[PDB]
Amino acid sequence: GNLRMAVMLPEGEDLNEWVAVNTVDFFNQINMLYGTITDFCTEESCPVMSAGPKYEYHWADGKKPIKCSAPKYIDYLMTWVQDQLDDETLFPSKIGVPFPKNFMSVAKTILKRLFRVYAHIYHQHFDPVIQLQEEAHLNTSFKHFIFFVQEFNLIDRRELAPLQELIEKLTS
Amino acid sequence: PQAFKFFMEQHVENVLKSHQQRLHRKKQLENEMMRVGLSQDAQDQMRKMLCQKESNYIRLKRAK
Ligand SMILES: [Zn+2]
């Protein structure tokens, strides 16, 4: 099916809410996704969190970088995003409570790091991904993710570098 | 192993069905609104109420 129509913002629907829901969804998807490949990123397979040799990812962002392996980066990333979603001052659960005025910031941040997970998986563990019939599901999840991101421009294009190999290919 | 696969298999149908369901909610609402002759004010009012209903629903769906 097509998601260009679906990922769009409906009439009267608050943007931050839409973004929140979709972000949570993609978060769950990615969580299970790595949950199936957690036995393969063993820190000997991925000594440094990187979307391939060229594209390398550090946790914090500079003066200068700090050592960041992949399983640490990802385990954290999960715990972190979970904490963010559980933060009632960012992701309210009661209808009377409005979003903070800085929501879209951490939205873009979270989605960016989720994409970084997508990247480490697509590049470093492409081979063991096929060891079980799973590439289609990954392609679907990532497709929805990218359609959404593009439709609302939630990640800088300069960040989407290490996966363009399929990006424009997938949106035929 | 299976969980991610099952979820991803059912997810597209899920969200698409959600989309069409919302569309049909709105269309049904305005279909009933066309008959029985309400004024523009009530139209806009209950429109806002519908949007709020939907936003509420997705917010509630998000957590537990
Ligand atoms: Zn790994």
Residue numbers in the entry:
A (entry chain A): 39 to 100, 104 to 213
B (entry chain U): 635 to 698
Cite, word for word, the article reporting this structure:
To exert full kinase activity, MST1/2 and LATS1/2 requires coactivators, the scaffolding proteins Salvador homolog 1 (SAV1) and Mps One binder 1 (MOB1), respectively. Phosphorylated MOB1 protein is switched ON to increase the binding affinity to LATS1/2 and this binding accelerates auto-phosphorylation of the activation loop, A-loop (also referred to as activation segment or T-loop), of LATS1/2 kinases for full activation. The phosphorylation of MOB1 occurs at two threonine residues, Thr12 and Thr35, located at the N-terminal extension out of the C-terminal globular MOB core domain, and is required for binding to LATS/NDR kinases.
We determined the structure of the complex between the N-truncated dominant active form of MOB1B in complex with the NTR domain of LATS1 to independently ascertain which structure of the MOB1-LATS1 complex is correct. The crystal structure of the complex between the NTR (residues 621-703) domain and N-terminal truncated MOB1B (33-216) was determined at 2.96 Å resolution. The structure reveals that the NTR domain forms a V-shaped bihelical structure formed by antiparallel long helices, αA (Gln636-Met668) and αB (Gln674-Ala697), which bind the negatively-charged and nonpolar patched surface of MOB1B. The V shape of the NTR domain is stabilized by formation of an inter-helical hydrophobic core with nonpolar residues (Leu663 and Met667 from the α1 helix, Leu672 from the connected loop, and Met680 and Leu684 from the α2 helix) and inter-helical salt bridges comprising residues, Arg659-Glu688 and Glu664-Arg681. The obtained structure is essentially the same as that of the pMOB1A-LATS1 complex, with small overall root mean square (r.m.s.) deviation (0.79 Å). The helical axis of the αA helix is kinked at His645 with the following part of the αA helix docked into the hydrophobic groove between antiparallel helices H2 and H7, and the αB helix interacts with the negatively-charged patch. Four negatively-charged acidic residues (Glu49 and Glu51 from the H1-H2 loop, and Glu55 and Asp63 from the H2 helix) of MOB1B form direct salt bridge/hydrogen bond formations with six positively-charged residues (His645, Arg656, Arg659 and Lys660 from the α1 helix, and Arg693 and Arg696 from the α2 helix) from the NTR domain. The observed MOB1B-LATS1 interactions in our structure were verified with mutational analysis. Alanine mutants of highly conserved arginine residues (R656A, R693A and R696A) displayed decreased binding affinity to less than 20% of the wild-type.
